[PDB]
Symmetry: D3
Subunit: 153 residues, 6 copies
């Protein structure tokens, strides 16, 4: 009965996130993606885009969440978070939250290294580049791309 | 059928390592500690010290290993490594090995943040301090302590 | 007569801060904690000062004052030229390193950093407040004097 | 016909920036300083003021020119027939952040980025910190070119 | 006439190195790859030079030479005063930053760093050799010219 | 009666070290420079040579003295009735490494450690790099005190 939660704003989900979801799904019986909550996409849109892109992952589901992440995790009977890291400075920042989360609620955090190809990918940078006309097609799920083009027009 | 391998030299295993073992054991059905191979303790001694300290973990076992870590992992039907991180610079160094390991053999790596109390603990520093008479009792399993005092006399 | 200033917003003071205060008061004849007022937070400056005084009652060579504007002026105005601050991480050091070099360049005021006690490496005022706002228990990270008042502000 | 673009907000230009300009100008046939403006947030200095302050302190660099722009930096670079950006770095933290943007810029436009290490004397200089310190009366004259410092005190007064 | 030196042991050259060579040759009129001999490794200096020449056949403005001793002497002896190097990480930058500042201080030679291509962020000569020694397949990380010879040295 | 210990191998002492000594001497009633010797590996300079080079360049610091030692630093500190160490740091990487040792030292002996940021001019100076560069003929005279530089060239010759 193993399981982890993968949290984030996912505004929108990127190939970097999807890679983390896939890897978490391969190592834990149950994965829940926690869409935490105003950016570009609504909660429902963000959830839909992730569901579309994770259809090949039978042991993953997507839910919105509010309040403390540890409460979200524990209220579903789990006590692990899985999170992707690019740096370095990411680890330092996330370490603080991870130790706090373990301290207040006994919830552990497992970090995975980003796939090399997506080291430079972030939701913020993808939206920024796309806004000014740059091609970010290779960095986002097929569905997501189109939806993003939609929001910009 | 989930599982991870926890690798290291463990010369000797510290409370920092034991904390990682416990956390891995709580999230994966099967944990294997891979004692990799001349420091202070022999392979057999290192294995024994870990077995002594992990008796309360029914789903963990301890084995020696040689060659590529990914071969050790895959030859036991697994494809996850779990490793503890203190920094920062640890993440940078380990990220390189993690991406290499994923590339050559499809083996993933999950990192956990060190418990705050053991941020300064390393096998090397514990042996160094103990050698010159410093008290490292609070940083090592009870059994290990005594064995270390033994080697020094 | 040696001395140092320990600056911060301390909104609220944490056990991490208090550890730094204690270690500074152990090594300098005089320590001044400077509670820096800004454009802002949860506690008033007077509330912050009083919480620090309560937690530092056992440190006779430390006192608490409010400050505004340029830190090196605050320091020099009081006949001192050293700052003492805690650091938790490497990136703590890199940001603080810039300010320390700037402060020494513009006023000849030096800065001494101490490493966090391991137990408080993850505590910050911001994170403590955020966790407490949503019902998380941060009593082990804050002095007794703070935890009671923090409950009051959230109710 | 080699060339590079040195981008920034330069609000204001610092001695650390000028060091980078000089080092780029010494290694590329032409250098363009790109003053990148956010049309949605004014800085301390207007675009013409930023350009003036840069020109006045680069007068001895014959192969350098100064132009403003906005939007994607890689478009600024490519429309001038170049494909190199040169930027200074102070810390490992700077490099991790800039690495993201450099790899993105190479991905979307094939434009490369060359980083140079700050001169030691300016490792702590930034436009924002110099403005903040000057706002509260601190002396930052040794961190800024002469073209900048009294213009800066003027803005604050 | 612009130019730069790309220094390293290149034992063996990787696709990461080659990416840096290509990017340097695209931006400077002349590039010299300097294969630095030391007290040592898997390949002879001549083997290393020949592997780089094979992988850089399409770069007419780049040439490969061996070097010994102080790098800034090598650079200045050839009428240049720029070094170009790849960086993979922040801690790459911090170590290289020291040497770059030293090299500019002692000889006025500057250093330009380029960020690794994402695909090769984890590749190093040391790790490639180590993996290959134990049967791991590193063919995707090394030029074709290297992978054949690496197999030979291990057999 | 405040005091601090400034530890190192000082093989040789650099201008970066001397900056740290001066800053410690300005803030503590007494400073002891601790020349820590590894009885198993000789450096470039003998203990007496290291001490001499330090004394000659700290002659204007009346509250500083120089002593050698080996073994645990915290024992050196405590046997002098002190419990503060002062050390310079250059980078975030330095801090992570030294943080480990500082926390260990506090754990085993209650001895505290105060770090100071390097002077910008010396951020790239290290004993090892200065020796390595000098070995191959590079000029490192501006990074070392006068008490050191020609002694160093002597060793290399
Ligand atoms: C952090 C991140 C974002 C973001 O934070 O916006 C978007 N993608 N990724 C990402 C996640 C894992 C690996 C690579 C990239
Ligand atoms: C890395 C390490 C060593 C070592 O590498 O020698 C000994 N303990 N630990 C450790 C492991 C996890 C958490 C804290 C400390
Ligand atoms: C920096 C800090 C904050 C803050 O930034 O608000 C709150 N506590 N601490 C802290 C201070 C010293 C040691 C550990 C933690
Ligand atoms: C990054 C920077 C700023 C800024 O970002 O505001 C102002 N100066 N510098 C600088 C540039 C190169 C070297 C040193 C300093
Ligand atoms: C640094 C390095 C080595 C090495 O250090 O031996 C081998 N490849 N690379 C590399 C170079 C540029 C980009 C990526 C990787
Ligand atoms: C660390 C160091 C060394 C060394 O470790 O060899 C030589 N100088 N410095 C130094 C000390 C303080 C500031 C700058 C530099």
């Amino acid at each position: 009965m193993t399981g982890a939660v993968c949290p984030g704003s996912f505004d929108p989900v990127t190939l970097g996130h999807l890679d983390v979801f896939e890897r978490a799904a391969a190592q834990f019986d149950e994965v829940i993606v926690a869409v935490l909550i105003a950016g570009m996409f609504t909660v429902d849109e963000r959830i839909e885009m992730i569901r579309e892109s994770t259809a090949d992952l039978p042991n993953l589901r997507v839910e919105s969440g509010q309040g403390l992440l540890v409460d979200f995790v524990r209220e579903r009977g789990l006590n692990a978070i899985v999170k992707g890291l690019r740096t370095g400075t990411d680890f330092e920042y996330e370490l603080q939250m991870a130790q706090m989360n373990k301290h207040i609620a006994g919830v552990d955090t497992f970090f995975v290294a980003t796939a090399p190809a997506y080291s430079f990918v972030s939701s913020s940078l993808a939206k920024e580049v796309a806004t000014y006309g740059g091609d970010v097609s290779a960095l986002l799920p097929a569905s997501v791309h189109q939806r993003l083009l939609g929001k910009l027009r």
